[PDB]
Assembly symmetry: D2
């Protein structure tokens, strides 16, 4: 299927491996905020909290779409290659998710690389989800059940959080939504990785992916950890999964294989491919119909635990 | 790959010399097994008679809650233009109604070969138009009507939007096409040949050719845009959600239809469900993909996400 | 992903009545012909009496001998463009590598001669070669048909016509990214690779060719226009070459498959990283050289049979 | 779709706890059926002993015609680095020799588990270098040597080209990789999972995992570029022809390898054979795809068409 015409038009606008992390971070915030502002999403209540993690205080933003106790809970991890982003760059997606799902969304401001190498973000991701499950009365959410959700690098963090919970014999993760996740962080190529990582696709080029990996990892061998590459994990007894992939996305192949691999272990799991679009398309919902459709789908899937 | 549960299911005889009544009986019986295992509730449900140009059209109205000015979905069941009824898709409609908050009106359009094309197309338009016109008796909002259908009914849904468009009418605000047949000529796509071998069971080459013979008076009739909406003018059509399945003969054409809508300025989204075959939505009591699809469909209609 | 050198070849390609488009196709093709600079032992032009009048054909003979194998070749060009001259290099190289006499047919071009003018010429020339083997020094029982793109269509249709008459002079068919469905019925590849970025065969160019070829668009429904709708039984064994980034890729590969369903031995090979028309670029494109080498050797040994 | 006859061939039917010798016997026996039905002629053939670093290596020399300074092909049989011999691919080597005009030297490299990685790799390079060094004894042209191999043998061919390059040697002018394994880690591609279920028989998920356990001392060794050449520096390698199969687990990595070669300025062609599975070349007596492949490969070597 071809690129959606509008996306084709949006892509015609003009990164380097030598740029410093700070500059790239600032541009990614600036660019992200354009989308947030055009979304202009409402939210009934929102506040930032500090969650005590292993590596220090973790900032989280709590989006509450309505009044009431024992509300459903989503722990959300923003994308950005493990290097970029924050709760600010995905704020609109979280608000809309909250409002459509009726769930309290807790978006976790995990530690970024290269300052905090793998597994810093993984630790924060687990610590924050566990904190939400354990401190439900402070938040007015369900006792010790959450859905985990995230996009791209955040989809990795969602999958691995589920895995870490399973490895610790914890049962608080009830549902997982992986939005075009990176599940193999080794340098091993898939057809989609090579096919859609050319400069022409902009958002996730080969050069950028290589750069993210150099920031994320302290040593090559860490890419082989199942907490880095969850596609190498034992996938039994993981919670039901929705995996969203994009057609013209380097991570498409591995995303679709993860869903299948989940099923081979008897986990209920659905993979859906959005045609016509690139990696990261959910954040463009104000101007891409596919983004709106995905947020609708993700919300309703969480609300009813449709895959379970 | 095919979902593991689906591989087990697909393990196990249609003939092109079967008489329509037999195929109809077996289709209803199989379908009803799925309806029973779903065991869906509904607040209110009534069967009505819509007076169509070609005669009386039975429809089933599923009301999931109380209130006037509820949104509505006109639903067209699949079955090759030859099989099925409101009964065969009753679970899907109740579940759609419940999740969407919308009144679902499922249409028992006339079947081929007794009523060849364009009988069912004309009934599909009449039924949808009747729902619009009689919004008050239904307690539905005439400004919030969607059309939806699976397979052949996905065709009838798409064509109904076209028919309304051609008459300058605006009562279809949204269309959800669940693995629709949009090119009824024998022109192949890669998917049409790839997933139509006997081992896929549900929509085989033999089965497709047989539907075609039942539906049309002459094979050339498939060249009509009311038969093959992929050949229609597609401008000024309502926003569309197209659901496709990975292992589906109709996959390519449905994804192509979504794309062609976009090229005419119509907002449209194609989503492919991996590891599943044509017809998988009706299998939702046992396929997670099915449940996810109904969830997706209902929410997309409820919020008109694609618009 | 596209071959990098083919990226650079397309970036340098951007950088209309039929006459002008014809002349530009001729001029740029000749660049490739000259850079190939292929030798040939003997070459001369003949005049084949066809139903529609005389048909120019070029005979490439690679060696001395009577009873040589024969290939009737039909050039591409969307039924509107091209000539024996635009594909001279490909034909010379095919003959040298195969050892076969190649008879390239200068079939009548649209819009001057609408469908089925070229179909009629393609059949008449293939038959003439079969009938006139002695004056050619060829074996009338070792004739293959071959052609690229529109010429691929002509070769498939010529084989169908012979079949319809119960004639057996066509023993092998090599369809080089053929167009087998000329209707507006879409395939995924037709839409996927027909954007401006691919240059050689864009949607606009395909539509333009269709308007030139057909007197009315519904003529595409004829099985002599769209051989994918023909009965495919008892046709000669086939080699079908497709290109990965080609609108016609799906239908080419569908055609090979449907031959198999009817009991015809048939092989479909897809060349990765390349676009429609890649064979003619062989002097600067490794896929092109490989394809000519494969086609020539397949013909020589009738490997698929 | 699968070629209909291949669908038949497959339908006429390994377990991960079988011992190496039983699987070797069964592989040899079944291979020899195909060798017998080809019944290829050869002008001259004899077995020689090549002194490798790790000991004596049997090679079979197929000479298709008279003359000194004939071109040469060093050929490595497939079999997962565990099965096979010069015997199992004898027909393919004879036919390749006759069609190419080249002397073919099929190398009986050491098999795992007895001789783990990098035993076969060292034998492969040593045999090829020996051919280049002893060109006068074989009557070949030391400036027209190609490497070739199928599956595991395609890996060995690829890696031999890399080893020659790493030593500043230039005796490998051409490489033909027939559905090679170029990534021996457990990292998946779409094709690896898609076509590795039991219904494909020839190269299943269980068989692939079993081969990886035999070949490697420790699992990390697969990260070596001499085991997984797709991770190697690919600059300054010889021109490549890569043959893939549509319904093959190794399809994706094979196509990726040809492209990676291109990114480093090496001339390379990847061609996908449709309708067929891994190993299809050895089936040429009964598969048109097999005969076409042998024709293609031999002609490409003869003229060094990709160069």
């Amino acid at each position: 299927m071809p690129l959606s015409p509008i996306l084709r038009q949006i892509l015609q606008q003009l990164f380097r491996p030598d740029m410093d992390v700070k500059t790239v971070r600032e541009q990614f915030e600036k660019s992200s905020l354009i989308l947030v502002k055009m979304a202009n999403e409402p939210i009934h209540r929102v506040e930032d909290i500090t969650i005590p993690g292993r590596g220090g205080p973790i900032r989280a933003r709590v989006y509450r779409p309505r009044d009431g106790e024992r509300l459903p809970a989503v722990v959300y991890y923003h994308g950005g290659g493990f290097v970029l982003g924050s709760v600010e760059t995905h704020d609109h997606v979280c608000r809309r998710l909250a409002n459509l799902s009726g769930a309290v969304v807790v978006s976790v401001d995990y530690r970024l690389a290269p300052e905090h190498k793998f597994p810093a973000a993984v630790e924060d991701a687990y610590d924050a989800a566990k904190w939400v499950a354990d401190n439900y009365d402070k938040l007015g959410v369900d006792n010790g059940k959450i859905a985990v959700a995230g996009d791209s690098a955040g989809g990795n963090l969602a999958a691995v959080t589920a895995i870490m919970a399973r490895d610790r014999g914890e049962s608080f993760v009830k549902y997982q939504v992986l939005i075009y996740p990176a599940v193999n962080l080794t340098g091993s190529p898939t057809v989609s990785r090579v096919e859609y990582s050319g400069p022409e696709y902009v958002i996730l080029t080969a050069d950028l992916m290589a750069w993210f990996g150099r920031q994320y990892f302290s040593k090559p061998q860490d890419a082989l950890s199942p907490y880095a590459s969850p596609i190498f994990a034992d996938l039994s007894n993981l919670p039901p999964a929705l995996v969203i992939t994009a057609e013209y996305d380097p991570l498409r192949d591995e995303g679709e294989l993860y869903a299948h691999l989940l099923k081979t272990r008897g986990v209920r799991a659905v993979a859906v491919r959005y045609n016509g679009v690139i990696h990261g398309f959910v954040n463009f919902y104000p101007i891409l119909e596919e983004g709106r459709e995905a947020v609708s789908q993700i919300a309703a899937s969480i609300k009813s635990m449709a895959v379970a």
